[PDB]
Design an enzyme around this catalytic site. Structure first.
Site, PDB file in Angstrom:
ATOM      1  N   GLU A  27     -10.246   4.626   0.836  1.00  0.00           N
ATOM      2  CA  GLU A  27      -9.440   3.603   1.516  1.00  0.00           C
ATOM      3  C   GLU A  27      -9.326   3.807   3.032  1.00  0.00           C
ATOM      4  OE1 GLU A  27      -5.138   4.656   0.315  1.00  0.00           O
ATOM      5  OE2 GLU A  27      -5.309   4.345   2.491  1.00  0.00           O
ATOM      6  N   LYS A  89      -2.941  -3.418   8.678  1.00  0.00           N
ATOM      7  CA  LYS A  89      -2.793  -2.831   7.356  1.00  0.00           C
ATOM      8  C   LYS A  89      -2.879  -3.965   6.343  1.00  0.00           C
ATOM      9  CE  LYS A  89       0.877  -0.844   4.533  1.00  0.00           C
ATOM     10  NZ  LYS A  89       2.181  -0.137   4.579  1.00  0.00           N
ATOM     11  N   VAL A 109      -4.227   1.004  -0.963  1.00  0.00           N
ATOM     12  CA  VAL A 109      -4.666   1.230  -2.324  1.00  0.00           C
ATOM     13  C   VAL A 109      -4.927  -0.071  -3.093  1.00  0.00           C
ATOM     14  CG1 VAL A 109      -3.863   1.961  -4.575  1.00  0.00           C
ATOM     15  CG2 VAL A 109      -3.781   3.525  -2.637  1.00  0.00           C
ATOM     16  N   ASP A 141      12.157  -3.113  -2.785  1.00  0.00           N
ATOM     17  CA  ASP A 141      10.982  -2.750  -2.010  1.00  0.00           C
ATOM     18  C   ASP A 141      10.072  -1.874  -2.887  1.00  0.00           C
ATOM     19  OD1 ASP A 141       9.061  -1.771  -0.262  1.00  0.00           O
ATOM     20  OD2 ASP A 141      10.461  -0.898   1.167  1.00  0.00           O
ATOM     21  N   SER A 143       5.813  -1.208  -3.793  1.00  0.00           N
ATOM     22  CA  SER A 143       4.444  -1.403  -3.333  1.00  0.00           C
ATOM     23  C   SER A 143       3.656  -2.336  -4.244  1.00  0.00           C
ATOM     24  CB  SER A 143       3.705  -0.070  -3.190  1.00  0.00           C
ATOM     25  OG  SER A 143       2.384  -0.279  -2.711  1.00  0.00           O
ATOM     26  N   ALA A 144       2.752  -3.113  -3.654  1.00  0.00           N
ATOM     27  CA  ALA A 144       1.868  -3.958  -4.442  1.00  0.00           C
ATOM     28  C   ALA A 144       0.858  -3.085  -5.213  1.00  0.00           C
ATOM     29  CB  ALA A 144       1.163  -4.974  -3.549  1.00  0.00           C
ATOM     30  N   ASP A 145       0.722  -1.831  -4.777  1.00  0.00           N
ATOM     31  CA  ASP A 145      -0.151  -0.871  -5.446  1.00  0.00           C
ATOM     32  C   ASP A 145       0.115  -0.824  -6.948  1.00  0.00           C
ATOM     33  OD1 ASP A 145      -1.184  -0.258  -3.007  1.00  0.00           O
ATOM     34  OD2 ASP A 145      -0.140   1.660  -2.805  1.00  0.00           O
ATOM     35  N   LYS A 162       3.444   8.886  -3.034  1.00  0.00           N
ATOM     36  CA  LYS A 162       3.869   9.546  -1.812  1.00  0.00           C
ATOM     37  C   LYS A 162       5.292  10.021  -2.048  1.00  0.00           C
ATOM     38  CE  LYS A 162       1.013   6.997   1.455  1.00  0.00           C
ATOM     39  NZ  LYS A 162       0.345   5.668   1.476  1.00  0.00           N
TER      40      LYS A 162
END
Ligand SMILES: *[C@H](c1c[nH]c(=O)[nH]c1=O)[C@H](O)[C@H](O)[C@H](O)COP(=O)(O)O
Ligand SMILES: *[C@H](c1c[nH]c(=O)[nH]c1=O)[C@H](O)[C@H](O)[C@H](O)COP(=O)(O)O
Ligand SMILES: *[C@H](c1c[nH]c(=O)[nH]c1=O)[C@H](O)[C@H](O)[C@H](O)COP(=O)(O)O
Ligand SMILES: [Mn+2]
Ligand SMILES: [Mn+2]
Ligand SMILES: [Mn+2]
Lengths: 307, 307, 304
Positions: A27, A89, A109, A141, A143-145, A162
């Site tokens: 990535e 990003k 990702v 909140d 992540s779309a990950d 993370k």
């Protein structure tokens, strides 16, 4: 069947796929936003070479002048590393616009999975996955990950989510969406800079071979979606828990007080933790990435063997 | 559509019923291993198969045996799951590939069961109660993968609703968000598992099997994928007393929380503890609701094969 | 089959490759009181027709999914009103099964448009995360349809009665682009601006259309939110409108309002507290969105 005006796979990678050599995707967000210059580009080219010395073929992924490019020149990587935060990003909702406006972007990702799957690459190495953020019970909140992992068939080798995130909420979230969280030689979920945490992976596997096997079974039985392979950072490079947690907690409080939100949170936290640790968190993160690249090469080799 | 015999095996009986267009009713394995103790586990499962047989319909109990996804089982196999109990891996979607890859036995939850049924093209599945949003999910994010399976996979699941140990209001909200119809059968009020009523409403209330089937057909012929929850109130005879059962559940929940029971262990612990606190009564109600659900699921089955 | 009927004025444009813009019936039945509901519907259609495109109002009549509608059916939805079933995705198959009539939400309108091949759809504003969804889990199925079904939805942003911040987080999570039209800040519905920002600011319909074809050709399923700031002169006073919305929501909570009936209640309550002005603002933002939508649909039809 995408047009070359959209997706361009580099000849090394194309040959790799023809000749059924194992390929590992990488990535670009990590370069642009994840790390500073010139550690980002050194790290990236070097990860590529690490993969090569394991006898696999790296394909770093990104958006170069509006094109989704699978595999990149040294030049383009130097580019993403120098231009840094000025580069966009790119998550899922971002992708079509950076492609249309013909600009450059660094894939997260999510996006890296999307493009990798478009190129028929099953194995993808990164540092740590996005996830559920601290406070997310009230902020939403997330992540779309995680949604990408739910839906797109790529294995993502990482050092866990993370550690700036909420790991517990993240493990619940992955279970709800049916995404395997595999510990490589570990039951405890690795936390990024740190080797263990209070949480558990969904299953411990002790070899690349068993992971490749699981992948083939999973996809052949029609269960679409990816798999997370959480790979602990090597002992030499692991941050001690107390220090790193203090720096993470402070950085997260600061971000709250400063009204940092959205796609800007992770870069802010990562940099601030690097400030707070005097570069140590960053060195450890780089070490974690090389490690995941190695394991990822083994997994892709094992997967290609079966497929 | 063509899945390898190594991964998926349908009993000859279920195969002739499918071939010969006899209505088939799916049944889950996890009810046996983690939802009930021995001998009641195996006993109930077999008597359920029989019940569906009286209705003139063919049962397929689903489980993972020796690494094979198995649609339809023998008495020996049901019994093995029954005596093996917690020694058998509880299997949700994230679990599935690893039990199958590693040649192990597993007891399928509503999600896994739906997945497999859908692979064998079985549209009707009878269970006790579906997983749902757990009490405290606002902060814990503990949300059954069952609800996601329901969101995407084409099976009708007949139950006494969500297990009363969950948070019913949030479950009803969750299903609305994810487009899953919650069908009260002959009731506008959501059945409570051990209880016939709750202070929550279904999305649609319908009074006959045929309506349920026709709604299934319009739903799929129209391309909206995902399953349907048909919530079937336990019969008045075997229902639990609101006071007693609620107290049991509340204590059980507080206890689980205080001990730090989390994840896939939560439900089986709470059912065990509730059965313990009710001196086995809750269990008896559970069994009775399962037979009831089986009967109704056979009727919906016939009506479905028809259209 | 016979379970979807498309009006000949609509199919005529599909076969002939002419711009088509979808509309929803919930705007009508549960969205606005009669007579202004039917009036608004018919005049919205007109606004499109005159804009150079063809209106198709989706709804369920006599159990049929109907693409494009008669003035008779529009007046019927507007009049029978709250007596018409409000239809989201979970609702849909039954309203069809039972051969009833229903007014389709943004979710169902996206579905139906998708069945018919209409990539562009205009409404007032989408559902989203409700205030207190963090504890209540009250989240519109609309957000999921946007996550999955391929349709562009042109609107004033999310209805401002909702929780907009949470809505933007949620859109990010599910990969749904939130496009501000000539604005960085997220249109607040009745208000022109909000403390929130969109995912990208795009200044022209063509840009948006290229984004659409690039997005779907690339295989990324799911729709797009295009947020259209209300015209400056029709915007509500922020103090008055927010005081109204806030009170109405406090009441809704007090009174045990929940589920599908939550938004219609609040809307009715808000125009009541604003003495009709928010409804008037509402009708205007709908027209405005119909215009931008027509432009998008045309520019997109041109491109592939
Ligand atoms: C994280 C990325 C990976 N490894 C690493 O060492 N550093 C990094 O910054 C990924 O890029 C991740 O996909 C990204 O953080 C996504 O976050 P959002 O939730 O903001 O999309
Ligand atoms: C519940 C199951 C059904 N009926 C019954 O009487 N007992 C039971 O245990 C389902 O198996 C359900 O899917 C189970 O709760 C698994 O859910 P989680 O994945 O959330 O544990
Ligand atoms: C909102 C609708 C759109 N514009 C407008 O001006 N007025 C309106 O009433 C939509 O109908 C929306 O999809 C509806 O609120 C669906 O909500 P739930 O299904 O979440 O109740
Ligand atoms: Mn985020
Ligand atoms: Mn759980
Ligand atoms: Mn709602």
């Amino acid at each position: 069947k995408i047009s070359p005006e959209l997706l361009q796979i580099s000849p090394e990678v194309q040959d790799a796929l023809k000749n059924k050599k194992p390929v590992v995707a990488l990535e670009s967000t990590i370069i642009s936003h994840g790390m500073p210059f010139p550690q980002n580009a050194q790290t990236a080219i070097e990860v590529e070479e690490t993969i090569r010395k394991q006898g696999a073929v790296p394909a770093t992924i990104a958006i170069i002048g509006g094109v989704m490019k699978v595999g990149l020149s040294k030049e383009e990587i130097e580019l993403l590393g120098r231009e840094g935060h000025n580069v966009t990003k790119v998550s899922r909702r971002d992708l079509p616009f950076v492609v249309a406006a013909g600009k450059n972007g660094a894939t997260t990702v999510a996006s890296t999975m999307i493009i990798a799957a478009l190129a028929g690459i099953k194995v993808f190495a990164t540092g740590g996955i996005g996830g559920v953020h601290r406070g997310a019970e009230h902020t939403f909140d997330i992540s779309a990950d995680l949604q990408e992992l739910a839906n797109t068939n790529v294995t993502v080798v990482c050092a866990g989510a993370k550690s700036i995130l909420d790991l517990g909420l993240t493990t619940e979230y992955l279970e709800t969406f049916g995404v395997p969280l595999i510990g490589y030689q570990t039951k405890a979920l690795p936390a990024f800079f740190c080797r263990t945490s209070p949480f558990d992976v969904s299953i411990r596997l002790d070899s690349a071979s068993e992971i490749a096997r699981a992948m083939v079974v999973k996809w052949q039985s029609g269960l679409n979606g990816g798999l997370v392979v959480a790979n602990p950072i090597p002992e030499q490079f692991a941050m001690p828990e107390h220090t790193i947690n203090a720096a993470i907690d402070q950085a997260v409080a600061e971000a709250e007080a400063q009204g940092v939100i959205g796609k800007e949170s992770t870069p802010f936290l990562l940099a601030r933790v690097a400030e707070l640790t005097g570069g140590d968190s960053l060195k450890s993160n780089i070490q974690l990435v090389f490690n995941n690249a190695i394991l990822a090469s083994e997994i892709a080799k094992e997967y290609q063997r079966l497929a």
